[PDB]
Amino acid sequence: EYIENWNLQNRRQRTGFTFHKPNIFPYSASFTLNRSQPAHDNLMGTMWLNAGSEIQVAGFDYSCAINAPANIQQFEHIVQLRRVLTTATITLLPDAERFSFPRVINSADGATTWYFNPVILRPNNVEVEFLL
């Protein structure tokens, strides 16, 4: 496969490598707090881990969207692949077990630590878009 791809690419021909669990996502465990405060008691945001071929994301609201317009809070996560993937089989599951247990998490600047105590609800209006 590799020499065939080498020769095809030398010929300016369309060739591809088939990967099982491609290692396309650089490791990154990070969070974004769309609503926060110094005491970190009423937070709203997203947590995610992108490792290899695996993405886990979890949008959290501490208030459970009590004051949100129509009691809905919208979370969005965009992962920009560094290369174009084709004919990709993808398993989608409705829960991120990585962000489903109590955690003590550093702050953005590392000044302090905040507490996360998830109670998992079913995600609503799940739309997964693959864009080129």
Binding site: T32, D41, N106, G110
Partner: protein, 276 residues
Amino acid sequence: QNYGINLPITGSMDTAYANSTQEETFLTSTLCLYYPTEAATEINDNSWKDTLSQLFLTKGWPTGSVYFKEYTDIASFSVDPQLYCDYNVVLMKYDATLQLDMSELADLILNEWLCNPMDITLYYYQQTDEANKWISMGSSCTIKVCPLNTQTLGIGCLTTDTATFEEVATAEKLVITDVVDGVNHKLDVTTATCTIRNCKKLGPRENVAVIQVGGSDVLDITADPTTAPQTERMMRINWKKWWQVFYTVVDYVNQIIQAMSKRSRSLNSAAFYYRI
């Protein structure tokens, strides 16, 4: 620098913790201690302020930063309680007959309130949502309310005769009135000696902690009957001697401040949201 907009902040897990900032905040913060007069009376030592200051210095605080404010009792302290220190600690003596007054005081000082003025002689007032209350403070504040129907006529009362009004507060130094939402009420308030304001509970006030000295878990800082939360800033202490109480406060000042945080509404970063 961008003060009017709420921008999301992206933090990364695995970012190394910063060293302890407890020493730096102790050196660059002020602590206010609110105690009743009976505490000083029992202690009976004109120099106890200096002793407590030196003990706090042994605990870290510079010897110019701990302030001791004295109040006669819960009822008097509830009239315009002004807490200006970076960290406020209030020793509140428990009385079994003043449970509601203690709860009202804690609700007023343990939470942030955004208050607009009220002209009961001019407008009929209504509470919009659960976060809205009518907070009134004064020497003697008596509040009576007459709910009005859609036709502005009173319900169970006559707008012309205040004698038929339903009395909700009598000779109160502080009272947080919660009426049915979405209903206009005609208000009769003894404005001559008390001020009423229409307030919203923005959220917790993190720089004020209350130690209930010798009681039980009775504070209810939320008007919702189904919730009586015990936040980290409301502690309880058994006591016989006030010197022991103050020694416990001094010795566990680290934990007490840990339970508290810098006032979110304060400091520069809160500019152009409500205050500074």
